[PDB]
């Protein structure tokens, strides 16, 4: 029974690092559990050489404005935009629809003809 999906094992990792931390003189033992890319894929990340992980600014230009957006609509309270709508717009813009090309559609239309045309070819090959 694996916590990660079968696909993700060859990529992902579960890192548990438990530390003693002091609080008001006492010591509480607190752990960081996290799911994380393996170091090969990690130095692929830090190299800016890695797919499946996309840079932020190519999604929407200049995050220095985007995360630093302070709300201006009829208000002098310059509080930042909330967390949830930023995460929401992020995961929306990630998940949008790509214009699948008719070329790939044509390759797939050729691939649909696999079995019928193969049987027709196998029948005429004798």
């Amino acid at each position: 029974a694996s916590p990660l999906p079968v696909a993700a094992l060859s990529r992902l990792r579960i890192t548990h690092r438990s530390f003693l931390t002091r609080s008001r003189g006492r010591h509480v033992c607190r752990s960081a559990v996290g799911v994380e890319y393996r170091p090969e894929q990690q130095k692929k990340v830090l190299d800016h050489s890695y797919a499946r992980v996309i840079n932020a600014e190519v999604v929407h230009g200049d995050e220095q404005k985007f995360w630093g957006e302070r709300r201006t609509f009829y208000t002098q309270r310059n509080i930042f935009f909330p967390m949830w709508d930023r995460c929401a717009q992020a995961l929306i813009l990630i998940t949008r629809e790509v214009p699948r090309v008719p070329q790939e559609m044509a390759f797939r239309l050729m691939a649909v003809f696999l079995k019928l045309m193969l049987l027709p070819r196998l029948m005429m090959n004798t």
């Binding site: 019928l116 027709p120 029948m123 005429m124 004798t126």
Partner: peptide
């Protein structure tokens, strides 16, 4: 599936060619 294969196995070469022609005309 087995009956169709058994029926096709008993057909001649000309019959198989005619069946192929019919399959090319109808289904293509």
């Amino acid at each position: 599936a087995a009956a169709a294969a058994a029926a096709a196995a008993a057909a001649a070469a000309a019959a198989a060619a005619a069946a192929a022609a019919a399959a090319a005309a109808a289904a293509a």
